[PDB]
C-alpha cells in the first residue's frame with residue numbers, strides 16, 4: 210500500500226530515520242547529497258514534497274535557516290525537532306557567537322538521542338507500525354553504540370597535545386569534544402560572512418605554534434581556503450571530511466555510520 214511518508218530537511222536525518230522506519234515507511238530528504246544545508250534555498254517542488262508527507266523531521270538548533278519560513282507554506286503536516294533534549298555547544302566566535310552549534314549528530318552518543326526522538330515521532334504519528342519502529346530503533350542504537358570502541362582505537366595513535374582538528378567550517382565541535390580534540394576552523398558556521406580572509410591568517414599562526422600536521426575541508430563547501438592554509442604552512446591538506454551531507458548511494462559515504470567512520474578514518478590518516 211501507500212506507505213507512511215517522512216520528509217526530512219537533509220540527508221543525515223533521512224538515513225537515521227530510514228533505519229528506524231525499515232520497510233514500513235518511506236523517508237526522503239529535501240536537500241540532495243552534496244548540497245549546502247544551512248542556507249539552502251527551497252523551491253516550489255520542495256513545498257509539494259513536504260506537503261505530501263505524513264511527518265516532517267528537522268534538526269532545529271537553527272541548522273536550517275530556511276526551514277521555519279518554508280514550513281509556513283505546509284498545512285496539516287506534523288513536524289518534530291530531532292535534537293530535542295540535546296545540550297548544545299555554543300558557537301564560540303563570529304557573527305553567530307553564542308548561538309547553538311547545530312552539528313550535534315557528529316557525536317554518536319548524541320545520535321542515540323536523535324534516534325529516540327525519531328522513534329517517538331514515528332510511533333506517535335504511525336501507531337500501526339509502532340512495534341517495528343521500536344524494534345528497528347533499538348537495533349540501530351546498538352549499531353551506533355558499537356562504533357565507540359573502533360573509533361577511539363582508530364584515533365589512539367595521536368597523542369593528546371597533538372590532537373588538533375583543523376577544518377574549514379567549525380562543524381566538528383561535538384565530535385572533537387567526544388574524542389578529546391582541540392578545534393580550529395576557518396569559519397565558525399556556514400553563512401555569507403566576513404572575517405574568513407583574516408581568520409585564515411590566525412589559523413596559520415596556530416598551526417605554526419603547535420606544529421599541526423594536517424588541515425581539512427568538508428564535502429558541501431569549497432576546499433580552496435584549507436588548501437591555501439596548507440600551502441602557507443608546514444601542514445598537509447588531509448582531504449574532505451563529511452558532516453553536513455551524505456554522498457550519493459554509490460558514493461563513499463552513503464549512510465550516517467559511514468559518515469562518522471570515514472570522517473574519523475580521514476582524520477586519523479592525516480596524522
Ligand SMILES: [Fe+3]
Pocket residue numbers: 247312378380399452453
Ligand atoms: Fe555545517
